[PDB]
């Protein structure tokens, strides 16, 4: 089973200039809980944005060019990325925009955080047909002293 996890600002913005400009610790804690002990697939730009291996997860990087770091697994196509994960229950795809586009048709579940923030960005989450997806979990949180915007965690499953 393939799942995508992402955090979206208004208008589905996910990034600007290879970064995420907001800071929502509760969302990063949600990301860690839902990815720990699973393989994570990311594109090369996202790998450079994170800047280090994510501990406790098998890190698989898509790139057309040879890898430059043996602390992670480098693959050259979508099918190779999936194969490198082996026989696990759930594969997590953690972006970015181009990678989300390619795995969306293959995904059974979406873990989405909707952030109430207006962000100029240059990268968007793919348009997804709403009729294809059932919301199975949602949890709204107001802003607090640690998280400066309100946010909604949502899990959707392909119907
Ligand atoms: N808000 C969120 O949840 C979230 C999550 C993740 C990322 N982001 C943001 O997303 C942005 C990065 O997204 P992006 O769309 O620019 O890049 P990306 O999807 O992270 O990476 C694209 C690169 O991945 C490689 N790639 C993708 N598909 C491939 C394939 N089928 N075969 C071989 N290589 C492949 C290519 O690397 P080569 O050029 O080396 O071939 C491609 O240039 C940043 O702003 C980041 O902060 C946000
Ligand atoms: N829901 C969600 N929110 C995000 O911000 C997000 N970001 C990415 C890409 N960027 C990043 C950047 C940093 C870390 C990171 O350092 N995570 C630590 C959290 C501990 C901490 O620094 O607070 C981790 O161990 O997972 C992960 C993804 C991919 N999917 C996401 N999904
Ligand atoms: Mn092939
Ligand atoms: Mn197998
Ligand atoms: Mn806000």
Are the C-beta atoms of residues 126 and 16 closer than 8 Å to each other? no
Both structure tokens of 91: 């594969």
Range of 25's domain? 1-159
**CA nearest to 158, candidates 82, 103, 96, 83:** 103
Of all helices (H) and strands (E), which one includes residue 95?
A: none
The structure was resolved experimentally with X-ray
Q: Ligand 1 center to residue 63 CA distance, Å?
A: 9
Would the annotation count 9 as a binding residue?
A: no
Q: Which stretches does DSSP call E strand in 9-150? A: 13-15, 39-43, 58-62, 73-75, 91-93, 109-115, 123-124, 133-141
15 lines ligand 1 (CB under 6 A): yes
Q: Which stretches does DSSP call E strand in 44-130? A: 58-62, 73-75, 91-93, 109-115, 123-124
Q: What is the resolution of this structure in A?
A: 1.2
Number of domains in the chain: 1
């Amino acid at each position: 089973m393939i799942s995508l996890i992402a955090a979206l600002a208004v208008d589905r913005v996910i990034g600007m200039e290879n970064a995420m400009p907001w800071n929502l610790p509760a969302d990063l804690a949600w990301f860690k809980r839902n990815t720990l002990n699973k393989p994570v697939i990311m594109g090369r730009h996202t790998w450079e944005s994170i800047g280090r291996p994510l501990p406790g997860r098998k890190n698989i990087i898509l790139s057309s060019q040879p890898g430059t770091d043996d602390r992670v697994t480098w693959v050259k196509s979508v099918d190779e990325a999936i194969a490198a994960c082996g026989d696990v229950p759930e594969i997590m795809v953690i972006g970015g925009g181009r990678v989300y586009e390619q795995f969306l048709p293959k995904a059974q579940k979406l873990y989405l955080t909707h952030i109430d923030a207006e962000v100029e960005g240059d990268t968007h989450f793919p348009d997804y047909e709403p009729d294809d997806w059932e919301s199975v979990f949602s949890e709204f949180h107001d802003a607090d002293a640690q998280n400066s915007h309100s946010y909604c965690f949502e899990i959707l499953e392909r119907r």
